[PDB]
Design an enzyme around this catalytic site. Structure first.
Site, short mmCIF file in Angstrom:
data_model
loop_
_atom_site.label_atom_id
_atom_site.label_comp_id
_atom_site.label_asym_id
_atom_site.label_seq_id
_atom_site.Cartn_x
_atom_site.Cartn_y
_atom_site.Cartn_z
N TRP B 34 39.49 36.92 35.91
CA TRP B 34 39.69 36.47 37.30
C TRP B 34 39.04 35.11 37.53
O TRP B 34 37.88 34.90 37.09
CB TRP B 34 39.17 37.53 38.26
CG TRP B 34 40.14 38.65 38.43
CD1 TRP B 34 40.13 39.87 37.82
CD2 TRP B 34 41.29 38.64 39.29
NE1 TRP B 34 41.20 40.61 38.24
CE2 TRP B 34 41.93 39.89 39.14
CE3 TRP B 34 41.83 37.70 40.17
CZ2 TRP B 34 43.09 40.21 39.84
CZ3 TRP B 34 42.99 38.02 40.85
CH2 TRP B 34 43.59 39.27 40.70
N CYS B 35 39.78 34.21 38.17
CA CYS B 35 39.28 32.93 38.71
C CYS B 35 38.81 32.00 37.59
O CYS B 35 37.94 31.15 37.83
CB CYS B 35 38.20 33.19 39.75
SG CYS B 35 38.78 34.30 41.06
N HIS B 36 39.43 32.15 36.41
CA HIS B 36 39.47 31.11 35.35
C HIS B 36 40.84 31.18 34.67
O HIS B 36 41.64 32.06 35.04
CB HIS B 36 38.26 31.26 34.41
CG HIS B 36 38.29 32.45 33.51
ND1 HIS B 36 37.44 32.56 32.42
CD2 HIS B 36 39.04 33.58 33.53
CE1 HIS B 36 37.67 33.70 31.81
NE2 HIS B 36 38.65 34.34 32.47
N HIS B 98 39.30 39.06 28.19
CA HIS B 98 37.90 38.74 28.53
C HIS B 98 37.58 39.39 29.87
O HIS B 98 38.37 39.19 30.85
CB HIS B 98 37.61 37.24 28.58
CG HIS B 98 36.19 37.00 28.96
ND1 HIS B 98 35.82 36.66 30.25
CD2 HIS B 98 35.05 37.15 28.25
CE1 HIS B 98 34.51 36.58 30.31
NE2 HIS B 98 34.01 36.87 29.10
N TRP B 158 25.58 35.80 33.67
CA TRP B 158 26.49 35.45 32.54
C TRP B 158 25.81 34.49 31.56
O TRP B 158 26.06 34.65 30.36
CB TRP B 158 27.82 34.88 33.03
CG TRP B 158 28.60 35.82 33.89
CD1 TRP B 158 28.49 37.17 33.96
CD2 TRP B 158 29.65 35.46 34.80
NE1 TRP B 158 29.39 37.68 34.85
CE2 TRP B 158 30.11 36.65 35.39
CE3 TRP B 158 30.24 34.25 35.18
CZ2 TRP B 158 31.15 36.67 36.32
CZ3 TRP B 158 31.24 34.26 36.12
CH2 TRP B 158 31.68 35.46 36.69
N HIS B 249 28.00 35.88 28.47
CA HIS B 249 29.16 36.74 28.83
C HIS B 249 30.47 36.21 28.20
O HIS B 249 31.47 36.95 28.29
CB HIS B 249 29.22 36.77 30.35
CG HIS B 249 30.34 37.54 30.95
ND1 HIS B 249 30.73 38.79 30.50
CD2 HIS B 249 31.11 37.27 32.03
CE1 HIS B 249 31.72 39.23 31.24
NE2 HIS B 249 31.96 38.31 32.20
C1 LIG Z 1 35.63 34.79 34.64
C2 LIG Z 1 35.11 36.07 35.21
C3 LIG Z 1 34.28 36.92 34.55
C4 LIG Z 1 33.72 38.10 35.18
O1 LIG Z 1 32.94 38.88 34.60
C5 LIG Z 1 34.09 38.33 36.58
C6 LIG Z 1 33.54 39.38 37.32
C7 LIG Z 1 33.87 39.54 38.65
C8 LIG Z 1 34.75 38.67 39.26
C9 LIG Z 1 35.30 37.62 38.56
C10 LIG Z 1 34.98 37.44 37.21
N1 LIG Z 1 35.46 36.34 36.51
#
Ligand SMILES: Cc1cc(=O)c2ccccc2[nH]1
Ligand SMILES: Cc1cc(=O)c2ccccc2[nH]1
Ligand code: NA
EC number: 1.13.11.48
Lengths: 273, 273
Positions: B34-36, B98, B158, B249
């Protein structure tokens, strides 16, 4: 209260009305707004009981025994409503919201799609971005020192100078057990909803799959408000409205027969393809 | 960025990496969380480029130009990923996720079946139900007033006290353009995923067709977390794990060589029947 059930919904025990009516679809999903429960719909359920399956979910911390719960929004209300429908094995439904139940209804149209939720009825829901008086009301509800002052001002607007016994009973008795945890949350979520989505009208226009939606309302009663509904309706073939001419913000209580015919009409439209 | 493409996926124009490598199957499907986006995999793509066809789909509103999109979940990510594989005419694939890309990977195993997706590799993915610290993080991300505070706390966890240049670049530069619409959504979907499925472990155990899955992770670093993986691995012949001993992470960034050998091993296993 014969129809009142409890079930585990993710992490939360939610109460919900279900008359378990064995009949043709769609099911009618009556959506409460903030800091009230299924009791708002007791008269509308009487109108629909015989002819339809009627489902009324209560939100987290909502019901006959209100409680403190973690912060949630209209997205969580949507997942909650669908999870109850998934548990009950209900497929096609006609959602009907009161006031800021509408944020849940429109998002539920988006998330359920047009096969599962082909139409929506929204009841007495402020279609424009918040006016100063309503904006102030949201600010008061969020204020831990002035939340009750918030509710008192809103009660005044909602009764609109009517000694309406049933609606007075709803506000003063049936919503008496709701505290700052709910009212504060309602202020934050609704203020956020307007700020992010602009208005119910902008949000409906922005649906991925536009569908027939009717706004049935008694207030605001001023012609300017009828005009924004007329202006939206002219612009959007899928959008219609009916001014119910009821005394208060709660047509589900004070004109339940009138709310019912619009629901039956949409339910009938859905059965006819 | 030689390999970056765009295509229409149902209603959404999604970007995706595809090196268009003409070689024996399976194709390696690297799944962002999420969000990458694909940028997280730039070093892992370097490891795999020569020997394999490498596909990296970006989610709705994800990519080099993040945008506001309607609310979607891991089910939508799965349909999106398959639609890209259908458009590219890719048949057999080895999915590699991931973190909360894993919800997509496990559902993709369920929906694609064991002929199309015979194995899966899940990278650094919290196997247990959310602990208080992570639960709080999800609550912050969902909060429109504290979402950035949410990301900052997660960045801290992370990086785990490491001045890891490449991972710092990913979090602070390559994720810089992602706003509340994504981060808020990630909090809601991941909270929903845990609430619905219980845990990644419960979800994998629940697959209709269990298959070889390896969890390779650097964190959490505490023996209790290694134990739940060891305990799951003891109970499930199809499940294995490797502790990569990377600083962060993001083992795809900080130990790309180590991620690569586990992928090559599984890719080789698939070619050998
Ligand atoms: C890149 C990425 C890693 C994560 O562990 C994560 C956890 C919660 C919300 C968004 C997230 N996004
Ligand atoms: C029951 C109910 C009706 C409303 O119009 C409203 C508006 C703001 C906050 C809470 C609310 N609650
Ligand atoms: Na119209």
């Amino acid at each position: 209260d014969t129809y009142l059930h409890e079930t585990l919904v993710f992490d939360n025990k939610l109460s919900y009305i279900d008359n378990q009516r064995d009949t043709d679809g769609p099911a009618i999903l009556l959506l409460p707004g903030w800091c009230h429960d299924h009791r708002v719909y007791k008269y509308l359920i009487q109108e629909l009981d015989a002819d339809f399956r009627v489902i009324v979910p209560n939100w987290r911390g909502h019901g006959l025994s209100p409680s403190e719960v973690p912060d949630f929004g209209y997205q969580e209300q949507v997942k909650d409503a669908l999870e109850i429908l998934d548990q009950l094995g209900v497929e096609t439904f006609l959602p009907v919201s009161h006031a800021h139940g509408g944020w849940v209804l429109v998002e539920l149209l988006e998330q359920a799609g047009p096969e599962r939720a082909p139409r929506g009825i929204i009841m007495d829901w402020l279609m424009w971005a918040p006016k100063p008086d309503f904006a102030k009301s949201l600010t008061l509800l969020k204020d831990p020192e002035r939340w009750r002052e918030g509710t008192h001002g809103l009660f005044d607007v909602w009764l609109d100078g009517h000694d309406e016994k049933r609606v007075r009973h709803h506000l003063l008795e049936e919503m008496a057990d709701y505290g700052y945890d709910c009212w504060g949350r309602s202020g934050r979520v609704i203020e956020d909803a307007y700020g992010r989505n602009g208005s119910p009208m902008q949000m409906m226009a922005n649906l991925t799959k536009t569908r027939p939606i009717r706004h049935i309302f008694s207030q605001p009663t001023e012609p300017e408000y009828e005009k924004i509904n007329s202006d939206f309706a002219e612009q959007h073939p899928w959008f219609s409205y009916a001014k119910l001419g009821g005394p208060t913000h709660f047509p589900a209580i004070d004109v339940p027969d009138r709310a019912a015919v619009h629901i039956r009409e949409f339910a009938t439209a859905i059965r006819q393809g």
